[PDB]
Amino acid sequence: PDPCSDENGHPRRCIPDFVNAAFGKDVRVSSTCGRPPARYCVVSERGEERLRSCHLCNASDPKKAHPPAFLTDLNNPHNLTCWQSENYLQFPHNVTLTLSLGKKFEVTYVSLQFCSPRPESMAIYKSMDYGRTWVPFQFYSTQCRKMYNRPHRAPITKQNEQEAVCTDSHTDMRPLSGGLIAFSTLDGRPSAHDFDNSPVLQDWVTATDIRVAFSRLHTFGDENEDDSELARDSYFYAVSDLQVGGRCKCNGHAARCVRDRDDSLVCDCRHNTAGPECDRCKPFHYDRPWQRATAREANECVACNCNLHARRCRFNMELYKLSGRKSGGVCLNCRHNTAGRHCHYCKEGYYRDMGKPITHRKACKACDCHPVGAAGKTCNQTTGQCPCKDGVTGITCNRCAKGYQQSRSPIAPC
Amino acid sequence: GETRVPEVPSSLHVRPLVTSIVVSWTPPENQNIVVRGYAIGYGIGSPHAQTIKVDYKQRYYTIENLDPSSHYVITLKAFNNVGEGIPLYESAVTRPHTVPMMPPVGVQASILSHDTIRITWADNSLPKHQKITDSRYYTVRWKTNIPANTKYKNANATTLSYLVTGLKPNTLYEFSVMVTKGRRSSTWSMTAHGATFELVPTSPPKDVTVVSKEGKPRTIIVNWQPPSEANGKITGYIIYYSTDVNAEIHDWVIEPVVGNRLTHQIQELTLDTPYYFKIQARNSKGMGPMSEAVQFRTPKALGSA
Ligand SMILES: O=S(=O)(O)OC[C@H]1O[C@@](COS(=O)(=O)O)(O[C@H]2O[C@H](COS(=O)(=O)O)[C@@H](OS(=O)(=O)O)[C@H](OS(=O)(=O)O)[C@H]2OS(=O)(=O)O)[C@@H](OS(=O)(=O)O)[C@@H]1OS(=O)(=O)O
Ligand SMILES: *[C@@H]1O[C@H](CO)[C@@H](O)[C@H](O)[C@H]1NC(C)=O
Ligand SMILES: *[C@@H]1O[C@H](CO)[C@@H](O)[C@H](O)[C@H]1NC(C)=O
Ligand SMILES: *[C@@H]1O[C@H](CO)[C@@H](O)[C@H](O)[C@H]1NC(C)=O
Ligand SMILES: *[C@@H]1O[C@H](CO)[C@@H](O)[C@H](O)[C@H]1NC(C)=O
Ligand SMILES: [Ca+2]
């Protein structure tokens, strides 16, 4: 069964399956251990005593390697696979993760599962364009104003709904392993209750790229000591899983996202819509203005009525309002010698053939008015009679009436 | 084979409620990898909040104790002793706690024929004279007034005017209309009476008995019951009699009877003669069909044997 159409065939809103846009994707990271191989340390608390078990990170050996591939691979709780940064890349230095999707996605959540303790300061950004410019999404810090120049736990108002909020909720050093930072886009937003009709939030959830930047590391305090060799080897960022959950942005006009000719992901547009995100109407389907599909009403594009005489059409708002917000389409360059808004009549100097219908190619016949005999170029649309000069008779005005003689003067033919 | 992690399930479906969410699924396509059970990860915004593990036989689960009007993201992982497989993601918003028309006026009966009657009604809800812009449907019922507790015959109509099909002539019918849109429904409208037009009878008169008059043998009394399919008001009856049954209809002696009478006397007849009788009913429209021939021999005279 087709999701974009009903049992009778009438169009209905269709959305692509909820997926993890991050899963199985290449993630560009600023830092990764094992190049050259270096020792790292895992701290395991025994009450007050801080026991430490040190291991080796080696990119060259898959058994000891922690590549950025481990961020989006199958997250198995039994066999955890996590990417690991270089040891002690403390503030102002920051480890950056960059996920690129060549398609607009309405992101609902962004979540990071950690192998090491969660950072003190972490930031999430999004990209509206394909990675060119960045827009802040969500901030996490114990010092919100001093780190990201944003107030701590800011109240989301109807005015600034697209505001990137800073919180201290998932900043805690403990748990030292298995810690999770999950960001829900629509959480706290006032218009969320009616997202389907909220363009402000429809835009907020939209993103092509996701950037996660870990600014500050959580430390016990041994970092600034003389014997800091073992201590600094214990601090790093390690992420077992990265999730970017949401839906392919098709504006409710496509049931699935399909790979295009340029190998990029695009919507399999339905409801006579076109473009990557089904943002526009299919050519010649400009009868009414484009609109995003809602659960109540599917806003399919309507084809211009041209009586099978035009391949191209335009739109006029004034005319659309005149029809009572029903139709505003105007046909362009009517073929088969026709004219009008909908090519509903014959061209100036062509008569309507009453036998054949208006949809047919042979609907209009040429007047064939004589340049000398006839006075005018346009003939009668019903009978086919051309306005002949004084003393001239006939459908084409080529005959002289009984009693009239053909003369040499062009003004008076008979 | 428990060496590999279970594959992604074949399908995932979510149905939302007030404080519940019904998760329904199908097992993974590849039956080669052994599946021990399923993991359901649910939560507001992200599916990380809570996790529920069910057996491999299970194909449905109802997530209880949920907040109303909240967007939930659900995940389904197939798992065994080596780990958890690729999840199927699906999201649903819980329905709110809130759980939920005037009958037509001016119902008039317009009789056209013996089998068809036009029913017209107006609405106070609509601003214009007639407006069909909303998804509303009318239901019309009909029954005979003569029999007690007659079964109602319902028919759904799109427009304000409807023609009733398959009706009996000379019978009073009552009509009721009701407007229906969505879940809410209105009661029946004021009953409008409509009597069907008269028609030519289709059944001959029943229980035809011929018995000779007591004392007078030349005079005979013919008794008959009214026909079942009268199709109108009885205006009269015509009795046909002839000594030969094989004779043409117009050769039989015509005897006219009035509508009120159901018994007639035929005088001046030959004694010891076998007579045949045929009766037909009549109304304002036409002439009904004739009854079967009834043989009756007149009594013998005092003379001879
Ligand atoms: O990280 S280093 O490779 O530079 O080794 C530094 C010290 O770590 C020990 C034990 O100290 S502890 O962790 O505090 O317990 O060895 C441990 O590290 C290596 C590599 O770790 S890894 O997870 O395997 O990647 C392991 O050696 S090996 O498997 O690569 O060959 C040790 O495992 S094993 O003993 O060989 O089986 C591992 O030991 S443990 O299980 O954590 O206890 C020390 O080595 S040890 O004294 O021989 O155990 C290193 O300290 S040392 O003074 O340099 O010897
Ligand atoms: C790193 O891995 C490579 C490949 O297994 C190995 O040759 C090399 O010796 C390793 N380095 C260390 C320090 O173990
Ligand atoms: C298990 O996890 C390790 C890292 O701890 C990884 O190298 C390996 O690829 C994973 N999978 C298997 C099948 O061992
Ligand atoms: C740290 O993050 C900033 C952006 O916040 C970036 O410009 C910079 O290159 C990153 N790395 C370092 C070492 O500053
Ligand atoms: C049509 O009328 C019948 C009467 O029995 C009823 O059961 C049915 O539901 C009606 N159709 C609709 C669409 O309601
Ligand atoms: Ca992983």
Which assembly state applies to the chains in this document? heterodimer
Number of strands of chain B: 24
**Helix content bin of chain B:** under 10%
Residue share in β-strands of chain A: 25-35%
- Helix tally of chain A equals 4
Identify the bound ligands: a molecule of 2 linked components (GU4-YYJ), 2-acetamido-2-deoxy-beta-D-glucopyranose, calcium ion
CATH C-level class of one domain in chain B is: Mainly Beta
Largest sheet of chain B: 5 strands, antiparallel
CATH topology of one domain in chain B: Immunoglobulin-like
Question: Your description of this structure?
Answer:
Chain A: Binds to its receptors; DCC, UNC5A, UNC5B, UNC5C and probably UNC5D. Binds to its receptor; DSCAM. Interacts with DCC. Interacts with APP. Chain A: It comes from Homo sapiens. Chain A: Its main location: secreted. Chain A: It is found in: Secreted; Cytoplasm. Chain A: GO terms for molecular function: DNA-binding transcription factor activity, RNA polymerase II-specific; RNA polymerase II cis-regulatory region sequence-specific DNA binding. Chain B: It comes from Mus musculus (Mouse). The complex is a heterodimer of chains A (414) and B (305). With 414 residues, chain A is mostly beta strands. Chain A folds into two domains: 269 residues, no CATH class; 145 residues, no CATH class. Chain A has four helices and 24 strands. In chain A, strand 3 and strand 4 form a beta hairpin. Chain A is rod-shaped. With 305 residues, chain B is mainly beta. Among the domains of chain B are: 86 residues, Sandwich (Immunoglobulin-like), CATH 2.60.40.10; 92 residues, Immunoglobulins (Immunoglobulin-like, Sandwich), CATH 2.60.40.10. Chain B has no helices and 24 strands. In chain B, the strands form six sheets. In chain B, strands 3, 4, 6, 7 and 8 form a five-stranded antiparallel β-sheet that branches. Chain B is elongated. The chains are: A mainly beta (414), B mainly beta (305). At the A-B interface, strand 1, strand 6 and strand 10 of A face strand 7 and strand 8 of B. Calcium ion binds next to strand 12 of chain A.
